[PDB]
Amino acid sequence: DFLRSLDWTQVIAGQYVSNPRFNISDYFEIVRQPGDGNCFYHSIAELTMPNKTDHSYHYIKRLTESAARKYYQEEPEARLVGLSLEDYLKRMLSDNEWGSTLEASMLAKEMGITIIIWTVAASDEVEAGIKFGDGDVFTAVNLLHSGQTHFDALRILPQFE
């Protein structure tokens, strides 16, 4: 309802932004993820893989590799990275290498999912979301980006369906 009124603006094909203001825990359960540099892929794994464990992220990194070989050359955010495909893959696959919005875009296409990354301010509230894919918040795989450096998984609270 609040969640049904989100206003997404498609800024570039397949990528949308929204600036609602809410307390994350009013609408979502946070499913905390470990770091060791892998928390982006752990968060994806939590929401896409049945029986997820602390090893599941390796599967998501392989799908990211597959995705990159199809999509990396044409990803707008890849222009920021500025690496050849092969150098990009070498870095991405490195142990503890951070994931990002670039991998979210490629994974949304590879996995056939919508990924939303909600970013939180120092005041604790969500101030913006970036969405990769056309699905709504109820269909999407929702991630929480915090401390400018960490991803956790989110699940919508049951009373909002």
Binding site: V11, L80, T101, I130, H145, G147
Partner: peptide
């Protein structure tokens, strides 16, 4: 212009 951020973690 629209500014969108690259977010890493």
């Amino acid at each position: 212009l629209h500014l969108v951020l690259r977010l890493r973690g």
